[PDB]
Paper text:
Enterococcus faecalis FIC belongs to class III FIC proteins, which are comprised of a single FIC domain and carry an autoinhibitory glutamate in their C-terminal α-helix. Furthermore, the conserved glutamate implements a Ca2+-controlled metal switch that tunes the balance between these activities without conformational change.
We determined crystal structures of unbound, phosphate-bound, AMP-bound, and ATPγS-bound wild-type EfFIC (EfFICWT) and of unbound and sulfate-bound EfFIC carrying a mutation of the catalytic histidine into an alanine (EfFICH111A). All EfFIC monomers resemble closely to each other and to structures of other class III FIC proteins. Mutation of the catalytic histidine (H111A), of the metal-binding acidic residue in the FIC motif (E115A), or of the inhibitory glutamate completely impaired deAMPylation of AMP-FAMEfFICE190G (mutant panels).
Author numbering:
A (entry chain C), B (entry chain A), C (entry chain D): 10 to 207
D (entry chain B): 8 to 207
Write the structure that this text describes.
C-alpha cells in the first residue's frame, strides 16, 4: 500500500530503506533538523513526513486504525488525540522526564508505520536541547533495546539505563547521527544500506 | 485514607473486609442486587458504592489519579470517561462478548480501589441476564485466575476458558453467591471472615 | 556461516529457503517421511538433517552454545541432553500430552537454527500417528501462532486451542502438507517461494 | 494442601502456625548466633536455613524437592535439572553486587525446596552480602510491589532487582533490628502478616 508501484514487500523494504535513509541524510545535512519544534507532536510529524512522504501517503498524519505489533498494547485510536495532547504538555527537564515522555510517545505510536525510526530522531533532539547530549546508538545493544522498550510501559528503568549509559556530549557529530540512523533502521530489521554511502 | 479512625493498614484490611462483606451479604439478601442496571458503569458504580461507602469517601466514583498495579497499565484518568462510555456501548450477547467486555472494564479499573471485587459481582450479573448462568468461583483456582487476568489484555482465551468451564445454571443459589464472595476476596488476599458468618 | 560460501544474510535466506524447501518436497514425495521414528529426538534430527544438510553443517546435530529469541528462555546447553532424554520419554496419548511434548521440544530448541520448521513437521507426524490428524496450518493465523508459542512455557492453552481447531483428518492430503510447509516458512519470515512449484 | 507434621488440615490455620513457628525459629536462628556458623553462598547453607525455619512443620524441610512446582510467569527449574543447577550455583562467584545478584537470581529460579524458597533464600542472600560486601539489605527500603515485579522480571533481566537491592544496602550488618524487620517484611512479601517476629 504505497505511492511507488511496489507490489512485493521485500522490494518495498529495500526501497523504503534507501529513499527514507536518503531523506534522513538530507534532514541532517541541510540543517533542516535544527529548525523543527523539539519534543512536540508537530515536530515528530515533521520528521515522519520528511522521512516518508515520497513512499507513503499517510506520512506525517495521525493514523485512523489501531495498530498491532506483537503483544504490545499501543494506544487505540479513540485515545490518540487525547494522548498526543497529553504528550505535548509533558515536561522534559531531566533524563527521567525525557525517558518518560519517550515511553508515552512510543505507546501512542501515532503513525501507520515508521513510529520507531521517526521517534528515535525526535528523542535525540529532546536530549540535545535539554541536556546537550545525544545517544551514541552503538552503546545500545539491539536485543537489549527491543526488550527494554517492550518492558517500558511497566517500568522504564531498563530503557533509562541504556540511554543514560549511551549519552555523549558530541551533539554536532555528524558521524554519531549518521551511524545512529543506520542502527535505528537495524533495530527494525532494515540493513541493506549504509546511510553515509547514499 | 478512610472514613474510620484507622492508622494501621492491616487493621484497615481487616475492617474493610468485614464491613464490605456485610454489605455484600445485604446486597444479595435484600434483593438489591436484582434491581441494578446490568453491564453499565452505572451498575458497577452502584455495586462499588454499596460495598465500600462506609469505608471510603471515593466509593462508587471514578478516580482522579492513576493507579499502578502488576504487569499492564490500567486506563489513565485522562482516558477514563471515554473508556467507560465505550464500555457502556459494548455488546453482551454471548460469552465471547461478555468476556471481552469484562476484560475492558478490568483494564478501565475506574475506582481508586476495590475494582476486582465489584467487577466480579458485576460480571456475574451480566452472565445471569444474558446466559442464565453465574460463575461457580469454587471451580476457578486463584493462581489460574490471576494469571489469566494478567494475560487478558493481550488474549482473553485463558480467562474465557476458566469462566466457561465454571458456568453453572444455579443462578438463584444463595450459597454459590456467598462462597463466590469469599473466593473473590481471597483472590485479593482477604481471608479473615466468612461472609455467611457475618 | 554455511556450506556454500555465502557472506550476505539476505542472499543466504533466499537460497536456504529454496534448497531446504526442495528437500522438504522430496521428504514427502519419496515417502521417506513415513519411515522416520515418530516423537523422538532421533526423528527430529533426521528431519532437520534432511532439510538443512545441504546448507548447514551441524544439521541434525545438537547445538553447542546457548541460543536466544527475544526474551524466550530456551534450554541452556548444559541441560540439553537431559531435556532431550526427558522429551523422548514424554507420553503422546492425547492432544494435551502431544501439545505439552511440543512445548518442551520448542523450549529445548536443540539445533543452532531451523528448530521451528523441523519441529512443526515432527509435531504433525506425532499427531498423524496418535490421533490420525494433521494440522491444517491455514487455520492458524501467524501472529496468533507466534504469540501462543511465546506464551506456552507458562500456559499452553493458546497453542493447544489453535492446534485443536486446525486438526484435519486429511493425513494423506499432499497439498495440506505442502501448504503447511509454505505457511511454516512464512511464520519464520521466508516468503519468496511456493514449495509446490519447486 | 500440603502434608505437615502438625495435624493441620485447614490451609489458613497452617499459614498461621507456619508463620508463627518458623518466625520463632528465625528469631532463635539469629539470637543463638547459629546464623554465623552457616556456610555462606552454597546450597548446603540455604538448606541449613530452610531446615532451621521449617523442620517442625514440614518433613521435606532442607531437602531438594522431587516434583516440579509452578507459580507465576516463569518456569522454576524442573527436578531433572535441579541437581546440576544447584551444583552450578554453588560454583558461581560472588565478589561484587552484579555477581551476587546474578547468583541470587539463579537460586530463585532453582527454587529447590517444595515450599518456603523465597524466605530462606532472602536470608541466604543477606548472609552473602554481609560476607562479600559487608552490607545487608534494609528491607524497609524495598516496596513489596516493586520487589515482586522485579523478581518476576529477573530471569529476563536482573536490572530492576539489582537496583532495588543496591539502593537498599546498609552497612549495619550486626543491627538486630534490621534483621528482625527484614524477617517481617520477607514474610509480608509472601502474604504472611499475622505476627511480628520481635513480639515472639
Amino acid at each position: 500500500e504505497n505511492k511507488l508501484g511496489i507490489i512485493n514487500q521485500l522490494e518495498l523494504n529495500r526501497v523504503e530503506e534507501r529513499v527514507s535513509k536518503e531523506n534522513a541524510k538530507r534532514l541532517y545535512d541541510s540543517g533542516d533538523i535544527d529548525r523543527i519544534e523539539v519534543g512536540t507532536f508537530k515536530g515528530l510529524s515533521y520528521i515522519h513526513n520528511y522521512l516518508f512522504e515520497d513512499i507513503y501517503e499517510f506520512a506525517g498524519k495521525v493514523r485512523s486504525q489501531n495498530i498491532s505489533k506483537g503483544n504490545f498494547r499501543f494506544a487505540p485510536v479513540m485515545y490518540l488525540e487525547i494522548a498526543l495532547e497529553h504528550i505535548d504538555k509533558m515536561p522534559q527537564r531531566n533524563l527521567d522526564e525525557i525517558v518518560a515522555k519517550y515511553v508515552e510517545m512510543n505507546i501512542a505510536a501515532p503513525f501507520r508505520e515508521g513510529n520507531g525510526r521517526a521517534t528515535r530522531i525526535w528523542l535525540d533532539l529532546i536530549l540535545k536541547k535539554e541536556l546537550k547530549r545525544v545517544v551514541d546508538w552503538n552503546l545500545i545493544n539491539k536485543e537489549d533495546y527491543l526488550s527494554a522498550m517492550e518492558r517500558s510501559p511497566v517500568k522504564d528503568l531498563e530503557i533509562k539505563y541504556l540511554i543514560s549509559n549511551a549519552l555523549t556530549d558530541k551533539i554536532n557529530d555528524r558521524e554519531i547521527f549518521m551511524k545512529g540512523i543506520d542502527i535505528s533502521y537495524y533495530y527494525e530489521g532494515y540493513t541493506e544500506y549504509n546511510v553515509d554511502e547514499l
